[PDB]
Design an enzyme around this catalytic site. Structure first.
Site, PDB file in Angstrom:
ATOM      1  CD  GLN A  85      -2.556   1.300   2.617  1.00  0.00           C
ATOM      2  OE1 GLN A  85      -2.725   2.301   3.289  1.00  0.00           O
ATOM      3  NE2 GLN A  85      -3.159   0.157   2.876  1.00  0.00           N
ATOM      4  CB  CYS A  93      -6.197   0.718   3.721  1.00  0.00           C
ATOM      5  SG  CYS A  93      -7.451   1.590   4.649  1.00  0.00           S
ATOM      6  CG  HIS A 113      -5.010  -0.607   8.590  1.00  0.00           C
ATOM      7  ND1 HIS A 113      -5.222  -0.335   7.248  1.00  0.00           N
ATOM      8  CD2 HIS A 113      -3.878  -1.350   8.646  1.00  0.00           C
ATOM      9  CE1 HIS A 113      -4.278  -0.905   6.525  1.00  0.00           C
ATOM     10  NE2 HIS A 113      -3.454  -1.537   7.347  1.00  0.00           N
ATOM     11  CG  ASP A 148      -1.540  -4.135   7.212  1.00  0.00           C
ATOM     12  OD1 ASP A 148      -1.499  -3.229   6.348  1.00  0.00           O
ATOM     13  OD2 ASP A 148      -1.434  -3.899   8.435  1.00  0.00           O
TER      14      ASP A 148
END
Ligand SMILES: [Cl-]
Lengths: 75, 204
Positions: B64, B70, B142, B157
């Protein structure tokens, strides 16, 4: 009367309410208690999402009922 | 540059997915991680999307680089790793993307995301209204995803250097084992923050 609201984290919030309170009022009480804006809150009872314009009485939510709170979060 | 964060909204995310080229999966709210509440989620659970306060040759990973992308990275991680079980529509935005970036590193894939105007445009068709600048500039939440790959639970992630392998699962234990992880590794660490959200990914 008292109702309980359960969060995803497993916390139970206790609220003081009247049958005549709207779902909007209940969301405003949760904000007073926890700082979460009403627009991010969804309340569920009996697997049904509760609509802002209805009262706790409309849904036959009685004393010591437990609601679930789901949060619409922006990530 | 500056993107609007996605809301953890089942309807929006489904419509966004269809438009990307995946209509075979849908999203369902998790009210809690106790067995009583998990039992009501329909099976087979394919993934868990999770929003919270902020040797892997077989797993598809993307870095990312755009701070509010995200939610879109989560959907890529989701569909990139369910590509075999739930194939994407042919010549769709994601079909094209996944083919283009297949021999690229997680870093280079991440940078191809920055250039993909189709995806940025679709993200912002389904991100849900904002009221003020802080909705877009002050993001404290997040958005990640848990999948099962070769019978292990894998946390994805794009801000981390690699996928995180958690544990083994088999049969329909995935949801329940992912709940334990979430409660132990994330929720327990946070005292007095209630700002968590979770969605089960199930077949449509
Ligand atoms: Cl909604």
């Amino acid at each position: 009367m008292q109702i309980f609201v359960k969060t995803l984290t497993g916390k139970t919030i206790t609220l003081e309410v009247e049958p005549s309170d709207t779902i909007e009022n209940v969301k405003a009480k949760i904000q007073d208690k926890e700082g979460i804006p009403p627009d991010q809150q969804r309340l569920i009872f009996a697997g049904k999402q509760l609509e802002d314009g209805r009262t706790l009485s409309d849904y036959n939510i009685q004393k010591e009922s437990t609601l679930h709170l789901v949060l619409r979060l922006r990530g | 540059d500056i993107w609007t964060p996605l809301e953890s909204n089942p309807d929006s995310l489904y419509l966004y997915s269809c438009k990307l080229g995946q209509s075979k999966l849908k999203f369902v709210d998790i009210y809690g991680f106790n067995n009583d509440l998990l039992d009501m989620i329909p099976q087979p659970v394919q993934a868990v999307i999770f929003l919270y306060p902020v040797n892997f040759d077989n797993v598809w990973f993307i870095k990312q680089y755009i701070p509010n992308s995200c939610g879109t990275i989560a959907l890529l991680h989701l569909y990139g790793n369910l590509r075999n079980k739930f194939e994407l529509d042919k010549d769709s935005v994601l079909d094209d993307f996944f083919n283009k970036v297949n021999e690229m590193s997680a870093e280079k894939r991440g940078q191809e995301l920055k250039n993909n105007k189709s995806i940025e445009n679709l993200h912002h068709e389904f991100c849900g209204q904002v009221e003020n600048r802080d909705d877009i500039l002050d993001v404290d939440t997040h958005f990640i995803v848990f999948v099962q790959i070769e019978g292990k639970i894998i946390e994805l992630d794009g801000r981390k250097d690699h996928p995180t392998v958690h544990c083994f699962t088999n049969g329909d234990n995935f949801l329940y084992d992912t709940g334990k992880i979430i409660q132990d590794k994330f929720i327990e660490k946070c005292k007095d923050d209630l700002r968590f959200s979770a969605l089960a990914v199930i077949p449509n």
